[PDB]
Design a protein around this ligand. Sequence first.
Ligand SMILES: *[C@@H]1O[C@H](CO)[C@@H](O)[C@H](O)[C@H]1NC(C)=O
Ligand SMILES: *[C@@H]1O[C@H](CO)[C@@H](O)[C@H](O)[C@H]1NC(C)=O
Lengths: 43, 48, 337, 264
Amino acid sequence: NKVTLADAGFIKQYGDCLDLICAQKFKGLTVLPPLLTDEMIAQ
Amino acid sequence: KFGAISSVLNDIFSRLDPPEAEVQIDRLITGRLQSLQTYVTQQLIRAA
Amino acid sequence: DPLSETKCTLKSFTVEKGIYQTSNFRVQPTESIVRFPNITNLCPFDEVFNATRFASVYAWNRKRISNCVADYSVLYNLAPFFTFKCYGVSPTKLNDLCFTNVYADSFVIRGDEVRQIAPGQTGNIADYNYKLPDDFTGCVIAWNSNKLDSKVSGNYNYLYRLFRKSNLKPFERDISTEIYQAGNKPCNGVAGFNCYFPLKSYSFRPTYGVGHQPYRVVVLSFELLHAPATVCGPKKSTNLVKNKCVNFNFNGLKGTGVLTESNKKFLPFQQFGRDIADTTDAVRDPQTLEILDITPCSFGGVSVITPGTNTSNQVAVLYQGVNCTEVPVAIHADQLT
Amino acid sequence: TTRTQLPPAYTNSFTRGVYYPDKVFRSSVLHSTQDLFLPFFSNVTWFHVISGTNGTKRFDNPVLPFNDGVYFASIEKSNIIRGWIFGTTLDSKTQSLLIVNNATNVVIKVCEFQFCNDPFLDHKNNKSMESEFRVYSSANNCTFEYVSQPFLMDLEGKQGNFKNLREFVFKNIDGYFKIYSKHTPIIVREPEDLPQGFSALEPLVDLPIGINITRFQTLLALHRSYSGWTAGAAAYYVGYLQPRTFLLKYNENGTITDAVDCAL
Ligand SMILES: *[C@@H]1O[C@H](CO)[C@@H](O)[C@H](O)[C@H]1NC(C)=O
Ligand SMILES: *[C@@H]1O[C@H](CO)[C@@H](O)[C@H](O)[C@H]1NC(C)=O
């Protein structure tokens, strides 16, 4: 909760993209999701 | 602007003749390439 | 196939197991739509320039052009009065472009010094009365009158910019008059300290068969595009296509994207939309009012997965950051590759 | 008349002098622009159009140079001020403009007129084609005309107790004329100072004429004393403009809710 102020976005499926991540994405600036997930890290 | 006439590709293409539009586009290409190389260098030095 | 693409991008005939980035996919436009304002009247050019004796060299007249359809092929084909050296305009693309607040002017000069007094360069008349910016958007046209428009009887006709103390303020005439001012106070009555009238010295006779020719000049001003355009080129307009990656040409703003309805609270004066990153995400119709959204069609990266060339040639392809339903393989009508 | 001079005074401008500088719509963005604007907390003259000497006409139409911009405002209870004549020397030899509110049209007449020493109008129409057009008597040559709905949409027919807060900025540059107007109701009857509050001056209409103007003149409507020509009370504000750098904050509605300069 403390760090979730800034994040990758938690969504990368483009379905909600029609407003900050999309602006960069439309200029061909993508973010690749990490290999390991939070569930695995917590495990 | 990078010393160009316009930052819009369509504008700089339709508003200019070929023999000058080439160097016009070249200047912007060089500027954006400099921006990209600077950015990737910063990415490496941060990954350090 | 993906194996060939991976081999080409890896510069080898053998590929080990792993995942590799090869290229990106994008959706090509399926058509093009043009939305342009409708203007009925034709723009007056011959009746506004090709006419009787033009305005004075010192006091040049300015004619305004607005709310019209302007064609330039007529002037291209119309007789002598050649030149038409556009400083920052492609001479063949004027008809395609739709202009803003075109201003016409009337010039008269001797003709022997037209090259030096040409716009963008310093000259006698240029340093006397009329100054032009470093690069004005308009074009300069010299009307080389050969025989009929050259006066053979009147010794004065239109005066000449004989003298001026210094260059005037930008875009101003030369209504300045009266007598020359000598070094030791201004002279009085010519005989005092050689007063010289700064004008009236045009003085071309019919026997002056080697001295220049009338070189009437017209200069225009356009290319603002911030306000809605007034003088628009003679190009057709077609019906708009919504919800498709189409080539739109809204009032000259050519581009490709998916047009959708917009909920933007456009104020009545506001015309163009934008975003954080200097991108026009919205547009107003140059036809029946409709605020429209702008969004480029889908694209993304392509990753190739192989278990090793020796092991097998079977490969798998991952499409990066795109929903499966929107971009399947059965949409290979305008997709890349 | 043999009216005497009056000493002009100044008052604080507070946060005023904000108009939309660009046509492009944007929302929820903090854009910074460099343009001519009123510096915050600047001196503004606040000439009071009161019945001079309890019924003597005053010369409260000073020949104010235009310079680069104006911030004409009004805290009038009713409609008393009409006329924004511009001119290099205010004669028949100089092209001049005027903004009248005759009937329900603006009549943007771009011509040369001979102007009287004290041009004024009548708020009430004359009985039986009124003689109000005494501000000028002769017109020589004409270039541009524009007739449309009046620039004042404020009506006092509802009731009293509320004065007007008409605001205007006249900006001329490179052969163009842009007008920005905005009206609000006023709560306090005190006219000494403008209320402290942000306001956006939306553009109304762009005039393209490129006349050279070096002075500004205003006109008043004094139908009759009901000796001389006089009417009720009025007040207007005059403020100049200079280039500055400002930061604008567009809201979710896409409107500028506040602005911050960069040199105060
Ligand atoms: C500004 O107004 C204040 C108070 O009215 C006054 O003291 C000062 O002299 C004025 N300055 C100018 C430049 O008008
Ligand atoms: C402005 O935005 C608010 C909140 O998003 C919304 O409720 C309202 O309808 C919008 N328009 C106006 C005119 O307030």
